[PDB]
From a paper:
Alphavirus spike proteins comprise trimers of heterodimers of glycoproteins E2 and E1 that mediate binding to cellular receptors and fusion of virus and host cell membranes during entry. We recently identified very-low density lipoprotein receptor (VLDLR) and apolipoprotein E receptor 2 (ApoER2) as cellular receptors for EEEV and a distantly related alphavirus, Semliki Forest virus (SFV). Here, we use single-particle cryo-electron microscopy (cryo-EM) to determine structures of the EEEV and SFV spike glycoproteins bound to the VLDLR ligand-binding domain and found that EEEV and SFV interact with the same cellular receptor through divergent binding modes.
Author numbering:
A (entry chain J): 263 to 418
B (entry chain I): 1 to 441
C (entry chain A): 197 to 245
D (entry chain M): 148 to 196
Amino acid sequence: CIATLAPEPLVEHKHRTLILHLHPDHPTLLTTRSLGSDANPTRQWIERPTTVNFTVTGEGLEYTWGNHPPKRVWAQESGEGNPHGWPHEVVVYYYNRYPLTTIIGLCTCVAIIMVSCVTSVWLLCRTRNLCITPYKLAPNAQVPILLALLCCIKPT
Amino acid sequence: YEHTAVMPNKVGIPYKALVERPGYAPVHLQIQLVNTRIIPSTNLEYITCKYKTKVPSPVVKCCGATQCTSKPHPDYQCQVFSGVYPFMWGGAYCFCDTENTQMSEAYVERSEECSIDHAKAYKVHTGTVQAMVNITYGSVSWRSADVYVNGETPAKIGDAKLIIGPLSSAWSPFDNKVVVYGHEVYNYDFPEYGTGKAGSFGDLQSRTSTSNDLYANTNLKLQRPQAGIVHTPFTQVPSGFERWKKDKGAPLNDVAPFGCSIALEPLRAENCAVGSIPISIDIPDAAFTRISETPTVSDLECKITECTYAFDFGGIATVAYKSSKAGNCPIHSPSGVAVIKENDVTLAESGSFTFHFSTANIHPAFKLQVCTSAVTCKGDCKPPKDHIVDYPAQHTESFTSAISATAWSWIKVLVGGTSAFIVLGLIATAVVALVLFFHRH
Amino acid sequence: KAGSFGDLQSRTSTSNDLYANTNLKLQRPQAGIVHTPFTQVPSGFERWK
Amino acid sequence: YVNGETPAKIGDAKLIIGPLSSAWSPFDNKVVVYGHEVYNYDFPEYGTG
Ligand SMILES: *[C@@H]1O[C@H](CO)[C@@H](O)[C@H](O)[C@H]1NC(C)=O
Ligand SMILES: *[C@@H]1O[C@H](CO)[C@@H](O)[C@H](O)[C@H]1NC(C)=O
C-alpha cells in the first residue's frame, strides 16, 4: 500500500545541535537515536508545526522523520574561540569543545596551584623565621649582610 | 606473506597498512569492511496472532434437556441454557413453552490473518559473526569477498588468505527473549507457553503456524440467548495481539545502540561499530617486487599547505621528492594522527607530489613513509566551519588532538610554576638546615 | 520562512515578484502513472490564522 | 515441560513442575554426533581442519 511521505524537515545546524522544523500534514512519527554506547532514543508523535533541537555529538545521530529513510548526521569540532591566542579565548574554545573537562580542569589546576602556592609560601615563611630568629635573639651581631637582605633583616 | 594487525570495527573506513617484507619493496594493503553481521542462533518458541471465536450452530432440543460434553478444543465453552422459546421466520421453532433447551458452544481458533501477520517469540543466545571485506594489495584491484569473523576460518579473497576476527567485544543488541513482528524486532520478555494472560500478549499461543495445540486464554463466557432469538451470545476479553500492537513502544531497530541495523532473514544486527577486529592476511609472493627493481626516493621535504581538522580529507601537503628512477610508489602514514587519502604516487626523477589527508589534531605532526624512506610533516590546522556533516569521521581523536601550542605552553608554565615554587621551598629548607648546623657545630 | 507567516509575500495584490519560500520538492511519479507528485510545507497564512 | 511456569493438564490436575535447581548439562559447548554416540569434542572450526 502507498503511505504518505511527510514534508521534508527544514534543517538548521548549530554547534552540536540539529534544529529540525517539522510541518506535518498528518500526525507523523519522529524517532532519533545517538550512534554511541548510549542510544538516548527519543520517540515523538508530531501533529503540529514544531521545532526540535536534538543534540548531535561526534559519535553521531540518526533521525527518522515519518516514512522517509533514516538520515544520519555527525557533528564536527566547529566550536567557537581562538586557540593560539589570548588566555580567555583559549578557555572559551575548550569550554565549547569540552564543557565538563575544562570546568574540572580549571578547578583542579586552580585548587592545585593554590594548594602548592600556600604550602610553598608556608615553607618559605618557616625558613625565614628560622633564618632570622637567631640574629633576632642576638641583639648584638654583625649580620651576614647578604643574608640580611635575602631575608628581611634590619642590620646593625 | 603473513601480516597481522588490528583494525576498528567501523564500516566503510578503510584500514591501510604497508606490508614490509625483508628484501622486497613494501606493498600497500587496504582492508575495508562493507558490512558486519551479528547473526544470533534463534529458537522459535511460539507464534501469537488474533483469535477467532468459532461459534458452531447451537443445538436446540425442543421438549428435552440435552447436556454438555467437553471437547478437546482451545477455550471450549458449552452451556445448556434452558427455558428458551426460539422464534424464527416460520415462527414457533419448538412447541413446549418452558421445557426447551439450547446448547451454545464456542471455541477460540487461530485467525485467518495468522498466516500473514503474527508475532514470533524467539530465544536467541549466540551465533556467528559474518562480514564482507574488500581488500586490495599492490596493483591487484578490489575483491569484495565474504568471511566469517571467528579468527580461524580462512577466506580466499582473490589470491590472499584472510583470517579475520574474533570481535573484541561480545556485545549483541538482542537479549535472551525477542519478538519479531513483520520487520521489527522487540526485546520483550514474552510469557512462556501456556502462561499468557487474557488480553496482554500471548493470549493465543501456537508453537507453529500450522499447529493444533493452540493454547488460548481469552475468558470466553457464553451468555444466555435473548428471548425468542436463536443465536449464541458470548463475551470475551479483546485480543492481546492488538493491544500489544498499539501499546508496543519502540522496536529494537530504533533503540539499538552503536548503530545496529536489524535485518530479519536471518535475524541479524548489522554494521555496529563496537570493539576491534584482529586480522591476519597472507599476501601472495607474486605481489612483491624485489627491492632492487624499485625506485629510491631521497631528499624528502614535506610542507603542509592549507589544512583543517574536518571529518573529510581537510589537509593538503606537498613533498619534494628528488629520486633515482621513475615509477609508482606507495605512501603511508603509520602514526595514526593522519589518514592519507591516496595509496600510491607516480614519481619522476625529481619534482614534487601532493597528497591529501585527514586529521583531528590542531598540529598534525605525522611521519609519511614514501617507498622506503620517511619524511616528517608538521603544520597548523584551522577549525572546520561546517557544524553538522553527513559522513562519519575518517580519523580518530586521541585526547591530545586539541591541546595546541598555546595551551601546551600554559600547562607547562603552570606545572613548572608549582614545581619550581615547591622545589625552591625545599631548597630553602635545606639551606636553613645547613646554615644552622654549621653555626652550632 | 517556509510555513510560519509571510511564506508568500507580494508587494501589491497585483504584483509579479511574489517571493515564495515553501520548500516545494517534486517527488518521483508512481510506477506507470502520468502525474506530477509534489511535497510542500502547508501555508503559513493558515497556520497564522 | 520443566520450567516452573507452564501448566500441564494431567487427567484433571494442573501440574506446574520445575524449574530444575541445577542448570547442569552433560554436553559441553561443542559436541560430535556419530551414529548413536555423542562425544564432547572441541572440533576444529569450519575451514580449519
Ligand atoms: C530550539 O532552538 C531554537 C533556536 O536556538 C529556538 O528558537 C527554539 O525555541 C528551541 N526549541 C527547543 C525546544 O529547545
Ligand atoms: C568494495 O566492494 C564493493 C562490493 O562489496 C564494490 O562495489 C566496490 O567497488 C569496492 N570498493 C571500491 C572502492 O571499488
